[PDB]
């Protein structure tokens, strides 16, 4: 069949700033079982129908996986504005795919908190669609240049989520998977059942 379990059943998940892109090709993709599963809280699809996923075949399908807080799931859309939608992960305005999100408070939330999940807060420009920036350099907040040391006007470009079990809805970790259906430039490789 197609490898989809590893994306939706991995023990660990990538951070927003360093979101992982999994390339999928030469497989029989059964998107129906994903839609059937009630676990996925969000299954919004742009420019495609859930039933048409199996009916229509594509090639070079990509899967982007990352974890964001609950209230930021809205920012994952073709047209949106936010700190994570402009500096961490930006969808193209003509995006054609499904965004899948589900609560994972029982796995990612550590009792005391951890630095496993973190997001980028400072960036001079806006990311282009389907672009990732994993550079970790001291951000410069004024005329005076900054060295390796960080202090006033010298900010580390990453901040860590405070995922804890006590956090209420809207701050608990939510797994997010973005499926990008690339146009059939090449011969079809990822077709439905």
């Amino acid at each position: 069949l197609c490898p989809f379990g590893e994306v939706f059943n991995a023990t660990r998940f990538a951070s927003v700033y360093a979101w992982n892109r999994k390339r999928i090709s030469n497989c029989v993709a059964d998107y129906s079982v994903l839609y059937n599963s009630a676990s996925f809280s969000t299954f919004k699809c742009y420019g495609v129908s859930p039933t048409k996923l199996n009916d229509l075949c594509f090639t070079n399908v990509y899967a982007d996986s990352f974890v964001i807080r609950g209230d930021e799931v809205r920012q994952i859309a073709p047209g949106q504005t936010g700190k994570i939608a402009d500096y961490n992960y930006k969808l193209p305005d003509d995006f054609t795919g499904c965004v899948i999100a589900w609560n994972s408070n029982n796995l990612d939330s550590k009792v005391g908190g951890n630095y496993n999940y973190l997001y980028r807060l400072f960036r001079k420009s806006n990311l282009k669609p389907f672009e990732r920036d994993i550079s970790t350099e001291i951000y410069q907040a004024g005329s005076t240049p900054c060295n390796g040391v960080e202090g006033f006007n010298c900010y580390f470009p990453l901040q860590s989520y405070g995922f804890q079990p006590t956090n209420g809805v809207g701050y608990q970790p939510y797994r997010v998977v973005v499926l990008s259906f690339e146009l059939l430039h090449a011969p079809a490789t990822v077709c439905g059942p």
């Epitope: 504005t81 960036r123 001079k124 405070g162």
Partner: antibody
Framework: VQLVESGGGLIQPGGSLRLSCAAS????????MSWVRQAPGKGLEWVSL???????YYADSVKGRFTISRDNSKNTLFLQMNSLRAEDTAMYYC???????????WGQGTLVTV | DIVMTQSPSSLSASVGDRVTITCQAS??????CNWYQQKPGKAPKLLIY???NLETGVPSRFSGSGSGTDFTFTINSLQPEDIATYYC?????????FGGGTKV
């Protein structure tokens, strides 16, 4: 570090006024510049926020009538108030936000009367 | 919009007394509760961010605590310079909301 503000005064209702927020030791192209106003003898209220990339957010009351823009040539922040009502009479501050709405450093402030 | 109910207001106390400002929110603002200090006739300056962290330069007398919906601010020692107005800001929801303010 300093944020000098100017451009206040008296404006006829329905008129257009643009404020200025001069900056020093800061790059208005970054640092999440913002505007916060306070009515005379009242509490604070957020007005607008400018992202480093260019994204802007406006309060619903001042939506449409207020426009925020930056000038990287001279490191100045501008707030073009297209339409002014009686409620807009307040004291306007431009503040540097460490995050989206942290407002670590605040400007001197300008007074606008309509 | 989150309503940042703040009480007591116009609190007055003698020198050295500890003041505990309570600012409650209608919705969960998990840890996002800034505290600002506004001297008369001047722009407010931030004192506490994330309702626990103390801004650099601010004296150690000021202290904040609390998470979830209810938050507390304590000036501890009541320095004569502390006379000002204090506000609580959620700065998390898209329309950030300030509290009523306390005339300490």
């Amino acid at each position: 570090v300093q944020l000098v503000e100017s451009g206040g005064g008296l404006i006829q209702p329905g008129g257009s006024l643009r404020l200025s927020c001069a900056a020093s030791e800061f790059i208005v192209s970054s640092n999440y510049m913002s505007w916060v106003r306070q009515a005379p003898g009242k509490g604070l209220e957020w007005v607008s926020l400018l992202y480093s990339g260019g994204t802007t957010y406006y309060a619903d009351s001042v939506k449409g009538r207020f426009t925020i823009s930056r000038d990287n040539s001279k490191n100045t922040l501008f707030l073009q108030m297209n339409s002014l009502r009686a409620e807009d009479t307040a004291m306007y501050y431009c503040a540097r936000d460490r995050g989206p709405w942290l407002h670590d450093y605040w400007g001197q402030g300008t007074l606008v009367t309509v | 919009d989150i309503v940042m109910t703040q009480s007591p207001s116009s609190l007055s106390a003698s020198v050295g007394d500890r003041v505990t400002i309570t600012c409650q929110a209608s919705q969960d603002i998990n840890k996002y509760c800034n505290w600002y200090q506004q001297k008369p006739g001047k722009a407010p300056k931030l004192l506490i961010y994330d309702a626990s962290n103390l801004e650099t330069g601010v004296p150690s007398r000021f202290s904040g605590s609390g998470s979830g919906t209810d938050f507390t601010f304590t000036i501890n020692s009541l320095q004569p310079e502390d006379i000002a107005t204090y506000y609580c800001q959620q700065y998390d929801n898209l329309p950030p909301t300030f509290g009523g303010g306390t005339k300490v």
